Design an enzyme around this catalytic site. Structure first.
Site, PDB file in Angstrom:
ATOM      1  N   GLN B  32      77.687  17.047  29.018  1.00  0.00           N
ATOM      2  CA  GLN B  32      76.336  17.335  29.482  1.00  0.00           C
ATOM      3  C   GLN B  32      76.152  18.665  30.223  1.00  0.00           C
ATOM      4  OE1 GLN B  32      75.748  12.928  30.840  1.00  0.00           O
ATOM      5  NE2 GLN B  32      73.673  13.781  30.875  1.00  0.00           N
ATOM      6  N   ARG B  90      81.334  13.353  41.518  1.00  0.00           N
ATOM      7  CA  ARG B  90      81.799  12.660  40.325  1.00  0.00           C
ATOM      8  C   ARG B  90      81.633  13.553  39.103  1.00  0.00           C
ATOM      9  NH1 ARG B  90      80.331   7.351  36.718  1.00  0.00           N
ATOM     10  NH2 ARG B  90      80.225   9.111  35.261  1.00  0.00           N
ATOM     11  N   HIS B 136      84.101   9.921  29.100  1.00  0.00           N
ATOM     12  CA  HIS B 136      82.661   9.757  29.257  1.00  0.00           C
ATOM     13  C   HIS B 136      81.923   9.933  27.945  1.00  0.00           C
ATOM     14  CE1 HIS B 136      79.271   9.930  32.397  1.00  0.00           C
ATOM     15  NE2 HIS B 136      78.697   9.756  31.220  1.00  0.00           N
ATOM     16  N   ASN B 184      83.286   5.259  31.436  1.00  0.00           N
ATOM     17  CA  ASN B 184      81.947   5.280  31.991  1.00  0.00           C
ATOM     18  C   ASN B 184      80.946   4.592  31.075  1.00  0.00           C
ATOM     19  OD1 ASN B 184      79.555   6.418  33.569  1.00  0.00           O
ATOM     20  ND2 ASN B 184      79.228   7.205  31.492  1.00  0.00           N
ATOM     21  N   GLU B 185      80.356   3.512  31.559  1.00  0.00           N
ATOM     22  CA  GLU B 185      79.353   2.780  30.799  1.00  0.00           C
ATOM     23  C   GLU B 185      79.806   2.310  29.411  1.00  0.00           C
ATOM     24  OE1 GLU B 185      75.346   4.430  30.931  1.00  0.00           O
ATOM     25  OE2 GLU B 185      75.745   5.449  32.837  1.00  0.00           O
ATOM     26  N   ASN B 325      76.345   1.905  37.825  1.00  0.00           N
ATOM     27  CA  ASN B 325      75.315   2.862  37.432  1.00  0.00           C
ATOM     28  C   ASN B 325      73.990   2.094  37.299  1.00  0.00           C
ATOM     29  OD1 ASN B 325      77.355   4.678  37.316  1.00  0.00           O
ATOM     30  ND2 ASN B 325      77.252   5.067  35.107  1.00  0.00           N
ATOM     31  N   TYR B 327      69.702   1.984  37.381  1.00  0.00           N
ATOM     32  CA  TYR B 327      68.475   2.735  37.212  1.00  0.00           C
ATOM     33  C   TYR B 327      67.208   1.912  37.261  1.00  0.00           C
ATOM     34  CZ  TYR B 327      71.257   6.754  35.830  1.00  0.00           C
ATOM     35  OH  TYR B 327      72.134   7.806  35.776  1.00  0.00           O
ATOM     36  N   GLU B 400      75.913   6.127  39.781  1.00  0.00           N
ATOM     37  CA  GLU B 400      74.795   6.779  39.108  1.00  0.00           C
ATOM     38  C   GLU B 400      73.494   6.137  39.570  1.00  0.00           C
ATOM     39  OE1 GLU B 400      76.595   8.372  34.746  1.00  0.00           O
ATOM     40  OE2 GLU B 400      74.652   7.401  34.877  1.00  0.00           O
ATOM     41  N   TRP B 451      72.488  10.769  40.324  1.00  0.00           N
ATOM     42  CA  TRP B 451      72.753  11.178  38.949  1.00  0.00           C
ATOM     43  C   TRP B 451      72.241  12.558  38.561  1.00  0.00           C
ATOM     44  CZ3 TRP B 451      75.915  11.703  35.463  1.00  0.00           C
ATOM     45  CH2 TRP B 451      75.567  12.151  34.178  1.00  0.00           C
ATOM     46  N   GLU B 458      70.786  15.565  27.569  1.00  0.00           N
ATOM     47  CA  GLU B 458      70.618  14.132  27.703  1.00  0.00           C
ATOM     48  C   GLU B 458      70.817  13.356  26.421  1.00  0.00           C
ATOM     49  OE1 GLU B 458      70.282  14.004  31.748  1.00  0.00           O
ATOM     50  OE2 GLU B 458      70.252  12.266  30.371  1.00  0.00           O
ATOM     51  N   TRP B 459      71.937  13.598  25.760  1.00  0.00           N
ATOM     52  CA  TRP B 459      72.226  12.891  24.532  1.00  0.00           C
ATOM     53  C   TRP B 459      71.024  12.952  23.608  1.00  0.00           C
ATOM     54  CZ3 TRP B 459      77.090  12.511  25.435  1.00  0.00           C
ATOM     55  CH2 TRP B 459      77.516  12.369  26.765  1.00  0.00           C
ATOM     56  N   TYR B 467      67.176  15.547  34.890  1.00  0.00           N
ATOM     57  CA  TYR B 467      67.635  14.534  35.837  1.00  0.00           C
ATOM     58  C   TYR B 467      68.232  15.122  37.113  1.00  0.00           C
ATOM     59  CZ  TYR B 467      67.374  10.207  32.958  1.00  0.00           C
ATOM     60  OH  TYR B 467      66.993   9.097  32.231  1.00  0.00           O
TER      61      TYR B 467
END
Lengths: 490, 495
Positions: B32, B90, B136, B184-185, B325, B327, B400, B451, B458-459, B467
């Site tokens: 990212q 992080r 990640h 991660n996630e 994480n 949101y 996050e 975050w 952002e993908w 963000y």
């Protein structure tokens, strides 16, 4: 032990609360063939398989209540009871069990006389339409509640209920369609210790050709279909603003074995496979999520039209409580596989927890451990999850052992404090639950009379009134029954 | 709406609201921000491929060939963190920038182990604890093109390379870093990569609308996930004997949306439970007790692989701290088992729907700007209490938390408004305060990470969302400017 100030007083409950005792048609009636009564399924079981009765006995006489109901009402009245919960013999009313097999007139006369006499003595009848006695005629014509066509049984049951509604509708104001379907189906097609006595191959029951994994569900599914059909009929032509109909569920309170969140989860599936199996359907219209996900395909579905008759199909619910258990988790894996329909709750039910001690003090027989606290647990679940509906404790009590090798002296049999203590405690728990918000409205002592105990034969006396079978079924009040007389009369 | 209803002055989180040992920082993702996708012989990740050959799968068609070009501005990045008084930072290591093959045979990129090497020392020279993320979502196209990447059937062709891309990290870095994060996630990764296929490579079942409609939305997400779980215990074990230390900690990062019953019915409570399961438990339960959660083993059945007892061992308790994480949250409405319903995604096995609007028609919380973030700080408390009361109350780090301001071609976001993120400031202050209430309630939370310390890629959302708490000027030299949020955070840590 017990306690002075802690002794339940009648003025602990509202005036309209009700107190009474209960019995089962096959367990006390006798007259198995008198006056053209059809052959129930239990008549057959006991006669052709006395090797499935702990003492090889049967109920060909029971407590001969068929000839002595006059006195049964007499005890109740001197006991000052508010109500009497008894059941009706489908075979004694419909010998062939069908509409066209004809309606046996004598049997109708009996229940009329009993009902009238109970009413002249200010006692309310709480009648159970079906208490395990399936006319043997239907048993062979299409396999009782095992009917895979779902119709014969439903129509044959619905018509039976209609006949009951037609001949005892004006006097009987409280009905119960079925009694403990969880057991009936589990014990008749799971363990198989109940008639007809089927089970999976290898297992040990009379006719090891059954399927303990698929049969219990089939029979239980029909039962629910029959309930919805009978209740639809009731609500449409017989329901009065002061009459009620519902059913009685057998039930033991579950508790986490250890402390893992896994045992809490087991507990939930346990309450589900036991109470929810039949409760959830009459409440929302379908079985518990857990069961549909663990018994997957072996649990039929309901047509939308059926989901509709089942939902809310009750005004009151009957609860039969005796003991509780610890539910220990059992994980899904290749090392485990369900043997009984009940093993679908992927949880085991212990009597002793991890501390090795019993979940409660033994009451005398192979399964009754005193844990009145589980009673409150159940009353709170009904209250907080399923709408806090009118609850009647339709069964509660213990069974003193009295066998060949260890006969129980009449003087001792009459001095049942283990029972008197048991009753007082549970009745006190209802005063705690009421204060906690429950909508309980009555209590019934199990077996107003000593009587036949299915596979247990005559080895246990559950009565509050002694029955001298080796006499003329003469009756003598037990200490428990005497306390109950003081409790109601004070 | 545009106006922000903020906390009363007295309600605004103060720093002396938390213990001196609590930690505050910001976070970012390798792909990212780094950019420099090839510079210095760096191996092609799976996302490089996705974006390049499939720019149609990117909302704006862009990619992260430059991102926030942090690859050359790590000095600037750390300087902002310093100023803001951040306690930690992080960040993740780029797989193809350590081994452009993910394996020994492929070797190592000199300058790769250089970049991250300098980055760490610099960070450590300002009292800033580094929290590194081993993986990640960035996979070396090497492996993906080889054996499909994390879709290894064998359970080791990928558990080997990773355990190697990892081990090798503990080699050139495990000497300064005192806190590690394996993955991660995972849930997002699996379900988004091989379920709905919005994440590279883009594999979803036939009939579905993804880049490669030949995958299996009901199985791949469950195998990739299966692999990641093994790859975790393998690595962790390795690090527990060859690079282990008493003052260190290691774990993973779990994405998690809060769950609340849709209605009053108990059926919706049940749905909520299966929902917490398919989301958090899928990966949490395995690293806590050894096996997936009961519900999944019953609803997904055979499609959810089993574990050998010598695996049910390396997973049970493989962590000293867990990363969360958070949101937003959702309403979970029951969905019954029946002939009229059948799963389409791996997520449909929860037999529950995840609504944003309640039965009252209103949103579970105020929309934060993008298509999925609804502010519901209460959900964060619910999560922390479950970790507390059901899973041992272990060390939790909110790894996050934040929002994304929408900025597109048709709706450009002026730098002025972009710099005044009161919507973001309010979201952060509210979640931070919720931690203060969770700490008083008994939760073992020990830190919070905002975050995206930086505006970045952002993908599938490309560059349509910012963000960051620090604005990045891509149409300049990726020059950074502190937003209002980042300025409050500087006052919060400095005051």
């Amino acid at each position: 032990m017990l306690s002075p100030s802690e002794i339940p007083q009648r003025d602990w409950f509202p005036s309209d609360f009700t107190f009474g005792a209960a019995t089962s048609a096959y367990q006390i009636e006798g007259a198995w063939n008198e006056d053209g009564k059809g052959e129930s399924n239990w008549d057959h079981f006991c006669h052709n398989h006395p090797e499935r009765i702990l003492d090889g006995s049967n109920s060909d006489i029971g407590a001969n209540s068929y000839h002595m109901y006059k006195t049964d009402v007499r005890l109740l009245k001197e006991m000052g009871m508010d109500a009497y919960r008894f059941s009706i013999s489908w075979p004694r009313i419909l010998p062939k069990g069908t509409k066209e097999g004809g309606i046996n007139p004598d049997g109708i006369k009996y229940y009329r006389n009993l009902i009238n006499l109970l009413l002249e003595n200010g006692i309310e009848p709480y009648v159970t339409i079906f208490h395990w006695d399936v006319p043997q005629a239907l048993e062979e014509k299409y396999g009782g509640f095992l009917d895979k066509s779902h119709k014969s049984i439903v129509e044959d049951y619905t018509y039976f209920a209609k006949v009951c509604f037609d001949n005892f509708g004006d006097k009987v104001k409280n009905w119960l369609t079925f009694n403990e379907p969880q057991t009936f189906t589990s014990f008749s097609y799971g363990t198989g210790v109940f008639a007809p006595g089927r089970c999976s191959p290898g297992l040990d029951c009379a006719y090891p050709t059954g399927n303990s994994l698929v049969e219990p569900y089939t029979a239980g599914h029909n039962i629910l279909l029959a309930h919805a059909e009978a209740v639809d009929l009731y609500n449409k032509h017989y329901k009065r603003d002061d009459t009620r109909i519902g059913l009685a569920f057998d039930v033991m309170g579950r508790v986490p074995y250890g402390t893992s969140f896994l045992d809490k989860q087991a507990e939930e599936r346990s309450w589900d496979i036991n109470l929810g199996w039949f409760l959830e359907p009459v409440v929302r219209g379908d079985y518990p999520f857990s069961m549909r996900s663990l018994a997957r395909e072996r649990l039929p579905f309901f047509k939308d039209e059926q989901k509709e008759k089942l939902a809310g199909s009750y005004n009151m619910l009957g609860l039969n409580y005796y003991t509780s258990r610890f539910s220990k988790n059992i994980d899904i894996s290749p090392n485990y596989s369900p043997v009984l329909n009940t093993d679908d709750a992927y949880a085991s039910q212990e009597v002793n927890g991890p501390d090795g001690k019993p979940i409660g003090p033994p009451m005398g027989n192979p399964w009754i451990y005193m844990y009145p606290e589980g009673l409150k647990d159940l009353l709170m679940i009904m209250k907080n999850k399923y709408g806090n509906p009118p609850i009647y404790i339709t069964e509660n009590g213990i069974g003193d052992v009295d066998t060949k090798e260890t006969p129980l002296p009449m003087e001792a049999a009459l001095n049942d404090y283990k029972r008197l203590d048991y009753i007082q405690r549970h009745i006190a728990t209802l005063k705690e639950s009421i204060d906690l918000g429950s909508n309980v409205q009555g209590y019934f002592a199990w077996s107003l009379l000593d009587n036949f105990e299915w596979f247990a034969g005559f080895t246990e006396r559950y009565g509050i009134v002694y029955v001298d079978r080796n006499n003329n079924c003469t009756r003598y009040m037990k200490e428990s029954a005497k306390w109950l007389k003081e409790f109601n009369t004070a």
